[PDB]
Scaffold this active site. Structure first.
Site, PDB file in Angstrom:
ATOM      1  N   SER A   1     -71.199 -31.285 -59.733  1.00  0.00           N
ATOM      2  CA  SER A   1     -71.326 -32.442 -60.955  1.00  0.00           C
ATOM      3  C   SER A   1     -70.259 -31.946 -61.869  1.00  0.00           C
ATOM      4  CB  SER A   1     -72.695 -32.402 -61.503  1.00  0.00           C
ATOM      5  OG  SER A   1     -73.504 -32.697 -60.569  1.00  0.00           O
TER       6      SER A   1
HETATM    7  C1  LIG Z   1     -75.054 -32.102 -60.580  1.00  0.00           C
HETATM    8  O1  LIG Z   1     -75.259 -31.235 -61.430  1.00  0.00           O
HETATM    9  C2  LIG Z   1     -75.634 -32.652 -59.445  1.00  0.00           C
HETATM   10  C3  LIG Z   1     -76.519 -33.929 -60.175  1.00  0.00           C
HETATM   11  C4  LIG Z   1     -76.765 -31.910 -59.091  1.00  0.00           C
HETATM   12  C5  LIG Z   1     -77.526 -32.133 -57.855  1.00  0.00           C
HETATM   13  C6  LIG Z   1     -78.251 -31.189 -57.133  1.00  0.00           C
HETATM   14  O2  LIG Z   1     -77.306 -33.090 -57.298  1.00  0.00           O
HETATM   15  N1  LIG Z   1     -75.145 -33.208 -58.372  1.00  0.00           N
HETATM   16  C7  LIG Z   1     -74.404 -32.318 -57.420  1.00  0.00           C
HETATM   17  O3  LIG Z   1     -73.954 -31.242 -57.548  1.00  0.00           O
HETATM   18  C8  LIG Z   1     -73.407 -33.188 -56.219  1.00  0.00           C
HETATM   19  C9  LIG Z   1     -73.729 -32.314 -55.055  1.00  0.00           C
HETATM   20  C10 LIG Z   1     -75.125 -32.871 -54.358  1.00  0.00           C
HETATM   21  C11 LIG Z   1     -75.033 -32.508 -53.204  1.00  0.00           C
HETATM   22  C12 LIG Z   1     -74.351 -30.836 -52.818  1.00  0.00           C
HETATM   23  O4  LIG Z   1     -74.937 -30.354 -51.777  1.00  0.00           O
HETATM   24  C13 LIG Z   1     -73.489 -30.602 -53.251  1.00  0.00           C
HETATM   25  C14 LIG Z   1     -73.232 -31.326 -54.735  1.00  0.00           C
END
Ligand SMILES: *C(=O)[C@](C)(CC(=C)O)NC(=O)Cc1ccc(O)cc1
Length: 493
Positions: free
Chosen positions: A247
């Protein structure tokens, strides 16, 4: 066997002082007493051996076997790195073939607090890790040379000529601010305890000068006492460990959206029902009770779906370009030993799956230094100043990588991420407006900068395997608050 010999021999140079940016000593070359022996002379004075062995805390027999075995050598060490008074006490014995010398050993006055940055020297005072290795030629200086005449047993009976005097190594002032370094070290250590985490990193950068003001990692080690240190404790994780930023890269995706002509912050995306199917793959949001979100809300809620739909619309090429221009997956130029470049994957053509995953920071690998340098560019009105771990007196020209208007807009969105209802309120810095973005990967990320109105400092906090995703924000709050006060930054809130 010869009746005499002549040898040109080295005059060791004094290794240069490593300091922090204000001249605080971090690595200092100190005279130590070394006791050595000429076995060929020892062999004539066997009745002295047991008293000498006893004075060296050696069993008599082990010591005698060692001299007997080395009978045809003219040099061995007895003990390196004594007190003057300590060696005096052994020289006081007047044993034939036993000699004291003053040589140089590094002391590290801040010890574990800056170990990973400074690194250390071997027994020969050669740089083996960290800055000690990276700037070894600078620090080492140039040995002198002198000619000696030796007798039949190889003892020096005349100093014949000095052909060359030794040249001392040069002082090196790091970019590190030791006061900020101690604050970051203490706060990262306390955060690991309070959260039962086992590793972490914290980087602080000057967004105007590209200088690394602090770089601390846990676990750490005392470089003054390396007895039986777990190899994990010597890792400069901030430079040599890569992670998925997730994120935390969404501000770069948003930068590309706002540069595209297609998006303003008040524009809406429908993220209902909090999931998005892409062939076999489903994008999932953390919170799934939204429909319409504005672009600022997409960052506050960190909506995976929201950033994915924006990415489909502007295309992956635009996002990949912003990430590359702010240094993700790129050589930093720091030349730190073991430093990683990480990975910003490319495609000739970006399908939907790969587009989305780029946009929310999946499949990327960055270092904490790279992520701090990217936030620095955004904070510095879109201009990337090259990184330095040495004091910058003459700042190099930066590169404009994000338009100042777009950077300003993204700054404002990140201030809302910290300050707005539903935002990361624990990242709020007392007396200041702060901006930044959390990430969750078993791994807690927070990246940001302050003051939001005229930014001075970028900071990345990474906490590995906490025991409860928002353990990193309060650390950012405490360390940013202390760093801005130490730097006499006027409060803007
Ligand atoms: C960011 O902080 C977040 C909203 C946290 C989440 C667990 O969904 N999104 C991501 O980190 C994006 C992402 C989603 C899945 C993954 O395997 C890596 C990164």
């Amino acid at each position: 066997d010869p009746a005499r010999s002549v040898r040109h021999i080295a005059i060791p140079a004094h290794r240069g002082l490593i300091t922090d940016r204000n001249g605080e000593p971090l690595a200092v070359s100190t005279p130590v007493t070394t006791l050595w022996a000429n076995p060929k002379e020892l062999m004539t004075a066997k009745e002295r051996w047991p008293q000498l062995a006893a004075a060296l805390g050696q069993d008599t027999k082990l010591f005698a076997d060692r001299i007997e075995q080395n009978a045809e050598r003219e040099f061995i060490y007895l003990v390196r790195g004594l007190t003057p008074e300590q060696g005096e006490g052994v020289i006081a014995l007047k044993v034939p073939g036993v000699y004291s010398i003053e040589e140089f050993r590094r002391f590290y006055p801040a010890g574990e607090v800056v170990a990973h940055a400074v690194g250390f020297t071997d027994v020969d005072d050669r740089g083996r890790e960290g800055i000690e290795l990276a700037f070894d030629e600078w620090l080492a200086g140039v040995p002198g040379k002198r000619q000696v005449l030796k007798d039949r047993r190889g003892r020096v009976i005349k100093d014949v000529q000095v052909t060359k005097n030794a040249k001392p190594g040069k002082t090196l002032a790091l970019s590190i601010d030791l006061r900020l370094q101690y604050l970051a070290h203490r706060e990262l250590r306390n955060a690991l305890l309070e959260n039962g985490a086992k590793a972490g990193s914290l980087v602080i950068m000057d967004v105007k000068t590209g200088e690394i003001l602090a770089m601390t990692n846990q676990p750490t080690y005392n470089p003054n006492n390396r007895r039986n240190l777990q190899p994990a404790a010597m890792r400069n994780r901030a430079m040599i460990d890569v992670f998925e930023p997730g994120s935390t890269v969404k501000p770069f995706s948003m930068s590309a959206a706002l540069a595209s002509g297609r998006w303003k912050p008040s524009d809406i995306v429908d993220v209902y029902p909090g999931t998005l199917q892409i062939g076999r793959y489903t994008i999932r949001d953390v919170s799934r009770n939204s429909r319409q979100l504005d672009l600022t809300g997409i960052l506050i809620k960190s909506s995976n779906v929201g950033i994915s739909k924006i990415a489909f619309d502007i295309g992956a090429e635009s996002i990949y370009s912003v990430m590359q221009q702010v240094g993700l997956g790129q050589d930093t130029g720091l030349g730190f030993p073991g430093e990683r470049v990480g990975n910003l994957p490319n495609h000739r053509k970006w399908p939907k799956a790969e587009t989305a995953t780029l946009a929310y920071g999946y499949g990327l690998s960055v270092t904490a230094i790279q992520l701090a340098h990217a936030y620095a560019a955004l904070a510095n009105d879109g201009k990337s100043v090259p990184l330095s771990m040495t004091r910058v007196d003459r700042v190099p020209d930066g590169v404009q990588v994000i338009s100042p208007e777009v950077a300003s807009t993204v700054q404002g969105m990140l201030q809302q991420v910290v300050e707005a209802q539903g935002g990361v309120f624990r990242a709020q810095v007392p007396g200041y407006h702060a901006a930044g973005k959390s990430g969750t990967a078993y791994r807690s990320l927070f990246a940001g900068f302050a003051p939001a109105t005229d930014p001075r400092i970028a900071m990345v906090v990474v906490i590995d395997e906490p025991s409860k995703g928002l353990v990193s924000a309060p650390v950012f709050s405490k360390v940013m608050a202390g760093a801005l006060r130490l730097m006499n930054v006027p409060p803007d809130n």
